[PDB]
């Protein structure tokens, strides 16, 4: 039913102010709370949007509201503020709880790096075994947050896809991987397939064909 829209990733230089947005149909008329969550932990609420009295949050955290976009503003941002932030509401349509999809806030602590992409088609071995996997390797990137779209009959494929979440590598950048699970004939049909890696409003694309 009711949806909340959050940017998947957001990066700030330290000391700068981070703005994290949460879009819902007149979200402005409802209580809007925020949760911080660091890796391997439970969420902590960081914006108690108390009805009829001031908010609760640590210093420099503040939830703002406007028509159909709530905002979580963190000023003079600090490394330890790096986390996934989730907004949460009550859709009393309805009678249920709604979260946004979460946002990795990255506090920039090293130079930005685009992804080094590498697509591998199914191996002849795997094909002979009556299977087929496409393998998209993504490496040497910072901040660690990509989104991956597969398609290329240019039509969005989804449905076959599994994607890892980024991880620190040897050289302190991030690495991630995606897979498009096919069957040999599915691979055979379409002329092409593409793995397209979005990274901070940029896009590195690669394509393969059963040549």
């Amino acid at each position: 039913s009711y949806e909340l829209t959050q940017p998947p990733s957001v990066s700030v230089a330290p000391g700068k102010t981070a703005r994290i947005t949460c879009g819902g149909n007149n979200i402005g008329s409802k209580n809007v709370h925020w949760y911080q969550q660091k890796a391997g932990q439970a969420p902590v609420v960081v914006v108690y949007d108390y009805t009829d009295r001031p908010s609760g949050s640590p210093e420099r955290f503040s939830g703002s509201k406007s028509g159909s976009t709530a905002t979580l503003t963190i000023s003079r941002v600090e490394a330890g503020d790096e986390a996934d932030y989730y907004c949460q509401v009550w859709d009393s349509s309805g009678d249920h709880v709604v979260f946004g999809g979460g946002t990795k806030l990255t506090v920039l602590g090293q130079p930005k790096a685009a992804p080094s992409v590498t697509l591998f088609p199914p191996s002849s071995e795997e094909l002979q075994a009556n299977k087929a996997t496409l393998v998209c390797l993504i490496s040497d990137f910072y901040p660690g947050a990509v989104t991956v779209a597969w398609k290329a009959d240019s039509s969005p494929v989804k449905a076959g896809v599994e994607t890892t979440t980024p991880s620190k590598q040897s050289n302190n950048k991030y690495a991630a991987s995606s897979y498009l699970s096919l069957t040999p004939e599915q691979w055979k049909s379409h002329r092409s397939y593409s793995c397209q890696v979005t990274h901070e409003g940029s896009t590195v694309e690669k394509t393969v064909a059963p040549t």
Binding site: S1, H96, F99
Partner: protein, 228 residues
């Protein structure tokens, strides 16, 4: 003030029924001021609320889940529970319990730590590994790319050496995806001298202790791009 801890089974066989329990202290389950909630989070994805129950009787549900979820409280033990039925690979997730503070439209102010629940057969399965051959494309000049695909195994973990540890320069071994079927896949890459591709040998050494298998896999260039 409120503290919560979940108890669960770790692994649950497909089609069957997940049952968790939560223990509370620092408030009574019976407070009119609280609801009691279950929230799950599949690895590296987002938070999904499951349901919330009041002592009074009211119970709120995730619409796409109402069908299969059951929630219960026990004032005597100051506990509450969840049951998720006809459980599938897509139910593998960390399950949190939280106190559901009834005011300001509802928020979860106090959380358990997680409990991971994997839904999969208890069975154990070693991996099929295939070569990720180097291409004319897998080269950015001098540096070529090549690797091994380690497909469909269970459970974690897997260890991937190259040649036999004899090659460790320029090797990133990726984390594994759990993929709706119950199985894991991972890849490991290695950058090499493209000039000597046709004279060398590059071998994956994949070990999956939970099955005592250990696969060597030689990755030769694409035969039709051979250099003679």
């Amino acid at each position: 003030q409120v503290q919560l801890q979940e108890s669960g089974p770790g692994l649950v066989k497909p089609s069957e029924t997940l049952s968790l329990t939560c223990t509370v202290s620092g408030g009574s389950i019976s407070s009119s001021d609280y609801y009691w909630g279950w929230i799950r989070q599949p690895p590296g994805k987002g938070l999904e609320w499951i349901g919330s129950m009041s002592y009074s009787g009211r119970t709120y549900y995730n619409p796409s889940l109402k069908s299969r979820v059951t929630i219960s409280v026990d004032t005597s033990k100051n506990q509450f529970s969840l049951k998720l039925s006809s459980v599938t690979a897509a139910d593998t997730a960390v399950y949190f319990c939280a106190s559901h503070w009834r005011y300001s439209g509802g928020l979860f102010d106090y959380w358990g730590q997680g409990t991971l629940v994997t839904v999969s057969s208890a069975s154990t399965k070693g991996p099929s590994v295939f070569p990720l051959a180097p291409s004319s494309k897998s080269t950015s000049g001098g540096t070529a790319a090549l690797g091994c695909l380690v497909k469909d195994y269970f459970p974690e973990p897997v260890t991937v050496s190259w040649n036999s540890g004899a090659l460790t320069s320029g090797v990133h071994t990726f984390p594994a995806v759990l993929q709706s079927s119950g199985l894991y896949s991972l890849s490991s890459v290695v950058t090499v001298p493209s000039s000597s591709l046709g004279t060398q040998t590059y071998i994956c050494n994949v070990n999956h202790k939970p099955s005592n298998t250990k696969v060597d896999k030689r990755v030769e260039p694409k035969s039709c791009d051979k250099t003679h």
